[PDB]
Design a protein around this motif. Sequence first.
Motif, PDB file in Angstrom:
ATOM      1  N   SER A   1       0.833  -1.190   0.000  1.00  0.00           N
ATOM      2  CA  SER A   1       0.000   0.000   0.000  1.00  0.00           C
ATOM      3  C   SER A   1       0.878   1.253   0.000  1.00  0.00           C
ATOM      4  CB  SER A   1      -0.943   0.012   1.205  1.00  0.00           C
ATOM      5  OG  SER A   1      -0.235  -0.088   2.438  1.00  0.00           O
ATOM      6  N   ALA A   2       1.371   1.591  -1.182  1.00  0.00           N
ATOM      7  CA  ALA A   2       2.221   2.761  -1.332  1.00  0.00           C
ATOM      8  C   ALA A   2       1.359   4.024  -1.257  1.00  0.00           C
ATOM      9  CB  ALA A   2       2.998   2.663  -2.646  1.00  0.00           C
ATOM     10  N   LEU A   3       0.433   4.126  -2.198  1.00  0.00           N
ATOM     11  CA  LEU A   3      -0.457   5.273  -2.249  1.00  0.00           C
ATOM     12  C   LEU A   3      -1.855   4.849  -1.793  1.00  0.00           C
ATOM     13  CD1 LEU A   3      -0.816   8.204  -4.614  1.00  0.00           C
ATOM     14  CD2 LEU A   3      -2.675   6.479  -4.640  1.00  0.00           C
ATOM     15  N   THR A   4      -2.485   5.728  -1.028  1.00  0.00           N
ATOM     16  CA  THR A   4      -3.820   5.459  -0.522  1.00  0.00           C
ATOM     17  C   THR A   4      -4.759   6.622  -0.847  1.00  0.00           C
ATOM     18  OG1 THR A   4      -5.047   5.270   1.451  1.00  0.00           O
ATOM     19  CG2 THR A   4      -2.961   6.271   1.731  1.00  0.00           C
ATOM     20  N   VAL A   5      -6.040   6.393  -0.599  1.00  0.00           N
ATOM     21  CA  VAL A   5      -7.045   7.409  -0.860  1.00  0.00           C
ATOM     22  C   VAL A   5      -6.786   8.620   0.038  1.00  0.00           C
ATOM     23  CG1 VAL A   5      -8.925   6.980   0.765  1.00  0.00           C
ATOM     24  CG2 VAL A   5      -9.437   7.447  -1.660  1.00  0.00           C
ATOM     25  N   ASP A   6      -5.913   8.418   1.013  1.00  0.00           N
ATOM     26  CA  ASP A   6      -5.569   9.479   1.943  1.00  0.00           C
ATOM     27  C   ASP A   6      -4.584  10.439   1.273  1.00  0.00           C
ATOM     28  OD1 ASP A   6      -6.369  10.285   4.543  1.00  0.00           O
ATOM     29  OD2 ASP A   6      -5.015   8.839   5.577  1.00  0.00           O
ATOM     30  N   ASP A   7      -3.492   9.870   0.787  1.00  0.00           N
ATOM     31  CA  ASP A   7      -2.468  10.661   0.123  1.00  0.00           C
ATOM     32  C   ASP A   7      -3.006  11.159  -1.220  1.00  0.00           C
ATOM     33  OD1 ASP A   7      -0.100  10.152   1.966  1.00  0.00           O
ATOM     34  OD2 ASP A   7       1.072  10.442   0.086  1.00  0.00           O
TER      35      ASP A   7
END
Length: 82
Positions: A1-7
């Motif tokens: 999980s490198a990029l998430t809906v958070d970032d």
Amino acid sequence: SALTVDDLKKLLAETAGEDDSVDLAGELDTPFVDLGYDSLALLETAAVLQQRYGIALTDETVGRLGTPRELLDEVNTTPATA
């Protein structure tokens, strides 16, 4: 999980400009068109997105898709090994 809906979300706002109630965590399945975000905004963050790694999430695919999760999944999908 490198990029998430958070970032990504933060990237969505920064680009789009929804610093009032851009709670994605409470609206993913819902398509941007449904919320408010416009394809344009996407095209914007799209470049900035590929500007970091090197993806092509433009109107092309952004056309078939219209959700945020799909924006993160896409980047969190396209492998690089083969």
